Amino acid sequence: QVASGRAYIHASYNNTIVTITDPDGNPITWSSGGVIGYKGSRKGTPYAAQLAALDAAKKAMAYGMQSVDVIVRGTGAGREQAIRALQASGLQVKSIVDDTPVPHNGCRPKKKFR
Amino acid sequence: AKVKATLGEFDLRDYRNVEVLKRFLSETGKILPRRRTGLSAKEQRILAKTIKRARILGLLPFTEKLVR
Amino acid sequence: ARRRRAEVRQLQPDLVYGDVLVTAFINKIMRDGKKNLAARIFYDACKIIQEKTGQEPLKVFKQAVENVKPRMEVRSRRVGGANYQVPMEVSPRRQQSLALRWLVQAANQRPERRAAVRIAHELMDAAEGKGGAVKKKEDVERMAEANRAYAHYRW
RNA sequence: UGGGAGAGGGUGGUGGAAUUCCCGGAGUAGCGGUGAAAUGCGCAGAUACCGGGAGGAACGCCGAUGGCGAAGGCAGCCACCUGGUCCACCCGUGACGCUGAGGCGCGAAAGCGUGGGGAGCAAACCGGAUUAGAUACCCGGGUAGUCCACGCCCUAAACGAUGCGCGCUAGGUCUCUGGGUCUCCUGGGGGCCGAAGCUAACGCGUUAAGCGCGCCGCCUGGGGAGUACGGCCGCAAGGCUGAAACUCAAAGGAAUUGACGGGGGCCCGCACAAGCGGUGGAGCAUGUGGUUUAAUUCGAAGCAACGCGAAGAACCUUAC
């Protein structure tokens, strides 16, 4: 049971994942569109990205989590929509941070990104 | 509104000038464009490599994180 | 329908209840322009609702409609290789049309042999917010709510 | 001589991000992927999050229409070695110059030899989709290869599709790099628009495709064919040089008018959509195709032929 922690936002284009973690980084709980109940294309939908944050929001307050860090790793359309679902979730969204890891410049991407 | 424009005399080669060099990093630690700094290409060229030193020299971040 | 918007027609209000909506609901019952027959069948159900659950027939009518007026509906859209069903709002115009269409059609499927009773039972269920016309509004806005994730596909 | 810029090159180092994998922690029922989906991975605990480690590769920001190089090509930063080049001084020599058949050297990528390494990506291959099929396009894997050393290979849309050197011929503008006396001028590169001119046109145009000169390479219709043969080189792939028979009456370049487009923009139409009512279902009328008899007269064939010519076939009509 903890009220302050970390909220991660893994927003892809095929899916979104929201992981409620403690301030120590350990995962309190997580959620994805597939867990919200959607499949295939529907997971990456923005509205699904909201609901995944909602369910993740509940499980936070399920452990008394009152306000956490808004850590964002992703670029999908469901990224901005998930930010609301934390904000109106009865949690104090405190630190909205972009942590989309970009290489500098790193490995060869797939064919899909060329 | 160039970054250099708000500066007095300073060496672009003084890589230990982390304060002035702090100005020319992005909000995310990226290197600002010339359009933000107005340096010459020669000036800009002096800027980037020197900045890269401070990054390897740890005086400056390779990358920040965006705080919306 | 490209240039103008094809504004709706101003329905002549009914003689009895002085309503356009009532006159509107008449025409959905009207067949072949047989408005006189359709007029009675409504006015007959007027008496029935005036008799079975004796109240203001008009107030029961509008109460029936509001219990069945939808507000969210899907719309087919072949985005990509997928024929989606985007949920959409509804202007009060199409809200009334869909409501009026359903209450008639739901009334067109009851078992009782005559129409005005079917209308009467329909308005009774409708004013009670029950029956097929309500279910339809229930099913649509539910189904419209089922695809809320597709909302951004709207246009 | 004094200076300047530079991803110019070699070597040796060395910084971080990111991926991947491993380890440890926390945690659960999905992840991932697509147009959708599936394969697949996951309960044996994945993804998502955190810390630590290993390793390989590549250098985000700067960054540029920028720079450098003869070309290929060159980009994290440091140091060393080293090349080319520009500016100013007008100091030295005094024609010592240009080209350049061969030869020599370099020469992306792929590929090959050996050895090493091997993160990601990914030929070949496997599977899932899609399909009528899909030896593909998309996805999941996935090995050579991709990276290093050395040795080969020598091809390319190796393109400015523009050999080099030099001189002259409006200009404007942008850009980088020097000098100055910093309005400006003087130089060296890199783009844009354009005089004259040239150009078949497109366009070129002081970075000529103009005007000239010197030198080299190259073309003589298309295909046959960069193939055959031969010769040389190559480990190999193959490369270089390079025909003919036969065959066609054209193959071509540019641009014009259209047309087309599963290009774009803009508009529009019961074209879609919102509705209402229909046909296709049944029987019948009628028209027609095809069958059939002497014959089913003939015509109309998508829209725009088919209750049409036929607004009247018992004989007539009527054409059989």
PDB file of C-alpha atoms in Angstrom, chain B residues 17-48:
ATOM      1  CA  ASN B  17      32.770  27.220 -19.880  1.00  0.00           C
ATOM      2  CA  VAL B  18      29.923  24.936 -18.863  1.00  0.00           C
ATOM      3  CA  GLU B  19      27.765  27.895 -17.852  1.00  0.00           C
ATOM      4  CA  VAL B  20      27.804  29.671 -21.207  1.00  0.00           C
ATOM      5  CA  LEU B  21      27.870  26.291 -22.935  1.00  0.00           C
ATOM      6  CA  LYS B  22      24.829  25.370 -20.857  1.00  0.00           C
ATOM      7  CA  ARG B  23      22.924  28.022 -22.808  1.00  0.00           C
ATOM      8  CA  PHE B  24      23.400  26.336 -26.167  1.00  0.00           C
ATOM      9  CA  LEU B  25      22.047  22.939 -25.184  1.00  0.00           C
ATOM     10  CA  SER B  26      18.409  22.275 -25.898  1.00  0.00           C
ATOM     11  CA  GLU B  27      15.814  21.964 -23.183  1.00  0.00           C
ATOM     12  CA  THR B  28      16.322  18.238 -23.792  1.00  0.00           C
ATOM     13  CA  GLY B  29      20.101  18.640 -23.837  1.00  0.00           C
ATOM     14  CA  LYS B  30      20.197  18.524 -27.632  1.00  0.00           C
ATOM     15  CA  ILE B  31      22.445  20.988 -29.413  1.00  0.00           C
ATOM     16  CA  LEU B  32      20.553  24.079 -30.461  1.00  0.00           C
ATOM     17  CA  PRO B  33      20.458  25.070 -34.138  1.00  0.00           C
ATOM     18  CA  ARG B  34      22.324  28.027 -35.544  1.00  0.00           C
ATOM     19  CA  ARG B  35      18.908  29.640 -35.960  1.00  0.00           C
ATOM     20  CA  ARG B  36      18.718  29.626 -32.167  1.00  0.00           C
ATOM     21  CA  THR B  37      22.333  30.748 -31.737  1.00  0.00           C
ATOM     22  CA  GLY B  38      23.195  32.727 -34.853  1.00  0.00           C
ATOM     23  CA  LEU B  39      26.816  31.628 -34.770  1.00  0.00           C
ATOM     24  CA  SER B  40      28.671  31.299 -38.028  1.00  0.00           C
ATOM     25  CA  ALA B  41      29.212  27.871 -39.496  1.00  0.00           C
ATOM     26  CA  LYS B  42      32.795  28.278 -38.320  1.00  0.00           C
ATOM     27  CA  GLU B  43      31.413  29.525 -35.012  1.00  0.00           C
ATOM     28  CA  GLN B  44      28.782  26.786 -34.981  1.00  0.00           C
ATOM     29  CA  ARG B  45      31.428  24.225 -35.919  1.00  0.00           C
ATOM     30  CA  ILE B  46      33.499  25.472 -33.001  1.00  0.00           C
ATOM     31  CA  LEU B  47      30.400  25.160 -30.853  1.00  0.00           C
ATOM     32  CA  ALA B  48      29.242  21.603 -31.501  1.00  0.00           C
TER      33      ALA B  48
END
